[PDB]
Protein backbone atom coordinates (compact mmCIF):
# COMPACT_ATOMS: atom_id res chain seq x y z
CA UNK A 1 0.00 0.00 0.00
CA UNK A 2 1.50 3.29 -1.20
CA UNK A 3 3.17 5.40 1.49
CA UNK A 4 1.05 8.47 0.71
CA UNK A 5 -2.19 6.53 1.18
CA UNK A 6 -1.12 5.18 4.58
CA UNK A 7 0.12 8.57 5.76
CA UNK A 8 -3.18 10.26 4.92
CA UNK A 9 -5.03 7.56 6.85
CA UNK A 10 -2.79 7.74 9.93
CA UNK A 11 -3.19 11.52 9.97
CA UNK A 12 -6.95 11.17 9.52
CA UNK A 13 -7.15 8.63 12.34
CA UNK A 14 -4.90 10.73 14.57
CA UNK A 15 -7.17 13.72 14.03
CA UNK A 16 -10.26 11.74 15.02
CA UNK A 17 -8.48 10.28 18.06
CA UNK A 18 -7.57 13.81 19.18
CA UNK A 19 -11.21 14.86 18.71
CA UNK A 20 -12.37 12.05 21.00
CA UNK A 21 -9.81 12.72 23.72
CA UNK A 22 -10.53 16.45 23.70
CA UNK A 23 -14.26 15.75 23.92
CA UNK A 24 -13.90 13.23 26.75
CA UNK A 25 -11.60 15.51 28.75
CA UNK A 26 -13.95 18.47 28.36
CA UNK A 27 -16.77 16.22 29.52
CA UNK A 28 -14.71 15.16 32.50
CA UNK A 29 -14.11 18.85 33.27
CA UNK A 30 -17.89 19.22 33.58
CA UNK A 31 -18.35 16.05 35.63
CA UNK A 32 -19.86 14.10 32.75
CA UNK A 33 -19.01 10.98 30.78
CA UNK A 34 -19.20 11.67 27.05
CA UNK A 35 -19.42 8.81 24.53
CA UNK A 36 -16.95 8.55 21.63
CA UNK A 37 -19.78 8.01 19.15
CA UNK A 38 -21.44 11.26 20.26
CA UNK A 39 -18.20 13.21 19.75
CA UNK A 40 -17.55 11.73 16.31
CA UNK A 41 -21.17 12.27 15.38
CA UNK A 42 -20.93 15.95 16.37
CA UNK A 43 -17.73 16.22 14.32
CA UNK A 44 -19.46 14.84 11.22
CA UNK A 45 -22.46 17.11 11.81
CA UNK A 46 -20.10 20.09 11.45
CA UNK A 47 -19.56 19.42 7.74
CA UNK A 48 -15.90 20.49 7.72
CA UNK A 49 -14.32 20.83 4.26
CA UNK A 50 -12.99 17.39 3.23
CA UNK A 51 -9.18 17.45 2.95
CA UNK A 52 -8.68 13.86 1.80
CA UNK A 53 -10.59 10.88 0.41
CA UNK A 54 -11.32 9.59 3.91
CA UNK A 55 -13.18 12.74 4.93
CA UNK A 56 -14.81 13.05 1.52
CA UNK A 57 -16.21 9.52 1.82
CA UNK A 58 -17.39 10.04 5.41
CA UNK A 59 -19.19 13.26 4.54
CA UNK A 60 -20.88 11.63 1.54
CA UNK A 61 -21.95 8.60 3.59
CA UNK A 62 -23.28 10.92 6.29
CA UNK A 63 -25.30 12.88 3.70
CA UNK A 64 -27.33 9.81 2.63
CA UNK A 65 -27.77 8.23 6.06
CA UNK A 66 -30.98 8.24 8.08
CA UNK A 67 -30.97 8.79 11.86
CA UNK A 68 -30.28 5.16 12.78
CA UNK A 69 -27.60 4.82 10.11
CA UNK A 70 -25.88 7.92 11.47
CA UNK A 71 -25.61 6.44 14.96
CA UNK A 72 -24.29 3.13 13.64
CA UNK A 73 -21.78 4.78 11.31
CA UNK A 74 -20.46 6.88 14.20
CA UNK A 75 -20.23 3.75 16.37
CA UNK A 76 -18.39 1.86 13.63
CA UNK A 77 -16.03 4.82 13.19
CA UNK A 78 -15.20 4.67 16.90
CA UNK A 79 -14.04 1.07 16.51
CA UNK A 80 -11.98 2.15 13.51
CA UNK A 81 -10.38 4.91 15.59
CA UNK A 82 -9.92 2.63 18.58
CA UNK A 83 -7.96 -0.03 16.70
CA UNK A 84 -8.50 -1.71 14.28
CA UNK B 1 -16.60 25.65 -3.58
CA UNK B 2 -14.36 24.97 -0.60
CA UNK B 3 -13.73 21.35 -1.68
CA UNK B 4 -10.70 21.21 -3.97
CA UNK B 5 -11.57 20.00 -7.46
CA UNK B 6 -9.21 17.01 -7.26
CA UNK B 7 -10.80 15.69 -4.04
CA UNK B 8 -14.17 15.83 -5.80
CA UNK B 9 -12.93 14.26 -9.01
CA UNK B 10 -11.28 11.43 -7.08
CA UNK B 11 -14.58 10.80 -5.32
CA UNK B 12 -16.50 10.97 -8.59
CA UNK B 13 -14.16 8.35 -10.04
CA UNK B 14 -14.42 6.22 -6.90
CA UNK B 15 -18.21 6.40 -7.07
CA UNK B 16 -18.06 5.49 -10.77
CA UNK B 17 -15.92 2.43 -10.00
CA UNK B 18 -18.50 1.18 -7.49
CA UNK B 19 -21.28 1.83 -9.97
CA UNK B 20 -19.20 -0.26 -12.42
CA UNK B 21 -19.04 -3.12 -9.92
CA UNK B 22 -22.82 -3.02 -9.47
CA UNK B 23 -23.79 -2.83 -13.15
CA UNK B 24 -21.53 -5.72 -14.10
CA UNK B 25 -22.75 -7.68 -11.09
CA UNK B 26 -26.38 -7.12 -11.98
CA UNK B 27 -25.61 -7.96 -15.63
CA UNK B 28 -24.13 -11.33 -14.71
CA UNK B 29 -27.12 -12.24 -12.57
CA UNK B 30 -29.64 -11.08 -15.15
CA UNK B 31 -28.04 -13.30 -17.80
CA UNK B 32 -28.76 -16.18 -15.41
CA UNK B 33 -32.36 -15.17 -14.79
CA UNK B 34 -31.55 -13.92 -11.31
CA UNK B 35 -31.99 -10.62 -9.51
CA UNK B 36 -28.89 -9.58 -7.58
CA UNK B 37 -28.96 -6.87 -4.92
CA UNK B 38 -26.51 -3.98 -5.11
CA UNK B 39 -25.63 -4.40 -1.43
CA UNK B 40 -24.69 -8.04 -2.02
CA UNK B 41 -22.42 -7.05 -4.90
CA UNK B 42 -20.72 -4.24 -2.98
CA UNK B 43 -20.32 -6.59 0.00
CA UNK B 44 -18.58 -9.19 -2.16
CA UNK B 45 -16.41 -6.36 -3.51
CA UNK B 46 -15.26 -5.29 -0.05
CA UNK B 47 -14.81 -8.96 0.87
CA UNK B 48 -12.09 -9.16 -1.81
CA UNK B 49 -9.82 -6.94 0.28
CA UNK B 50 -8.44 -5.23 -2.83
CA UNK B 51 -5.46 -2.92 -2.28
CA UNK B 52 -6.76 0.62 -1.59
CA UNK B 53 -5.88 3.11 -4.34
CA UNK B 54 -7.24 6.20 -2.61
CA UNK B 55 -8.50 7.58 0.71
CA UNK B 56 -12.04 6.46 -0.07
CA UNK B 57 -10.99 2.83 -0.45
CA UNK B 58 -8.65 2.97 2.51
CA UNK B 59 -11.42 4.18 4.84
CA UNK B 60 -13.87 1.59 3.48
CA UNK B 61 -11.50 -1.32 4.03
CA UNK B 62 -10.59 -0.14 7.54
CA UNK B 63 -14.29 0.20 8.42
CA UNK B 64 -14.97 -3.25 6.98
CA UNK B 65 -12.17 -4.76 9.06
CA UNK B 66 -13.79 -3.72 12.36
CA UNK B 67 -17.41 -4.39 11.38
CA UNK B 68 -19.51 -7.27 12.72
CA UNK B 69 -21.92 -9.12 10.40
CA UNK B 70 -24.81 -6.68 10.88
CA UNK B 71 -22.58 -3.62 10.47
CA UNK B 72 -21.21 -5.02 7.20
CA UNK B 73 -24.71 -5.47 5.78
CA UNK B 74 -25.69 -1.95 6.87
CA UNK B 75 -22.52 -0.29 5.55
CA UNK B 76 -23.04 -2.01 2.19
CA UNK B 77 -26.62 -0.70 2.17
CA UNK B 78 -25.43 2.84 2.91
CA UNK B 79 -22.81 2.58 0.18
CA UNK B 80 -25.52 1.64 -2.33
CA UNK B 81 -27.40 4.83 -1.40
CA UNK B 82 -24.15 6.77 -1.85
CA UNK B 83 -23.55 5.25 -5.28
CA UNK B 84 -27.12 6.04 -6.41
CA UNK B 85 -26.91 9.64 -5.17
CA UNK B 86 -27.94 12.66 -7.28
Write the H/E string of chain A, N to C: HHHH
Strand content of chain A: under 5%
CATH class identity of chain A: Mainly Alpha
CATH fold type of chain A? Cytochrome Bc1 Complex, Chain D, domain 2
Number of strands of chain A: 0
Helix content of chain A: over 70%
CATH superfamily of chain A: Protein of unknown function DUF3243
**Number of domain modules of chain A:** 1
Any idea what the CATH architecture of chain A is? Orthogonal Bundle
User: What is the CA-atom radius of gyration of chain A, in angstroms?
Assistant: 13 Å
Envelope shape of chain A: globular
- Describe the biggest sheet of chain A? none
PDB class: structural genomics, unknown function
Keywords: yflH, Gram-positive bacterium, Structural Genomics, PSI-2, Protein Structure Initiative, nesg, unknown function
Assembly: dimeric
Entry title: Crystal structure of YflH protein from Bacillus subtilis. Northeast Structural Genomics Consortium target SR326
